[PDB]
Amino acid sequence: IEKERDVILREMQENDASMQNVVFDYLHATAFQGTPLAQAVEGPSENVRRLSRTDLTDYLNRHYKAPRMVLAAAGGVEHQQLLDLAQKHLSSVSRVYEEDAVPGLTPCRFTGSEIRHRDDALPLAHVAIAVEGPGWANPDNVTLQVANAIIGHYDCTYGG
């Protein structure tokens, strides 16, 4: 835990040195502020340093439940053999909760806002502008992906 904690500190420094991830994390924070969707996946360094083994066991016993797990196989695999192996191994996952401490999905507000991290010594500027999306279950995802295909993408090494 201590060794990987040092690894996470070094990797957070590396990802801070990465230009695009900083901007996407800033966009997530300034779009879903005040909600659990604002916080980055790696988490703050204070929580990384102060996190203990008992928090990891609590997360394992709270979030690694049976019905929120999908065992997916693709390729030269038989579903009957996969089901038999899943019955052999992943049968006992303890879907029940510790004291009926069942969590719940809460909607996260979208807000119109900006964050500007000005540091003029850097060579290039990264800017991301977004709006509120439709969600997974909304049938407008195909239309909005088509519109994203209309707008397209470009890199400076494109041969077009």
Partner: protein, 77 residues
């Protein structure tokens, strides 16, 4: 001169909200009257006393002009 470059700024993060998502008059009175009263306290002693002297010698000049208009009884015979 042009908006792209004017000065060198490093490590400064600015947070801003949408005008259609925040109020236009947030605590206009409760946080507004103490602010203007604090500004008045800060800049009341350097402004008011000269105008007090204006008013004082205004009244003094009017009084002296009206007294010069008024005659005197130095003419009894």
């Amino acid at each position: 001169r042009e908006f792209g470059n004017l000065a060198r700024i490093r490590h400064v993060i600015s947070y801003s909200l949408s005008p259609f998502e925040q109020r236009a008059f947030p605590s206009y009175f409760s946080k507004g009257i103490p602010n203007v009263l604090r500004r008045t306290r800060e800049r009341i002693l350097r402004v008011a006393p000269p105008f007090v002297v204006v008013y004082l010698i205004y009244t003094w000049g009017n009084q002296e002009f009206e007294q010069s208009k008024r005659k005197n009884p130095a003419m009894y015979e």
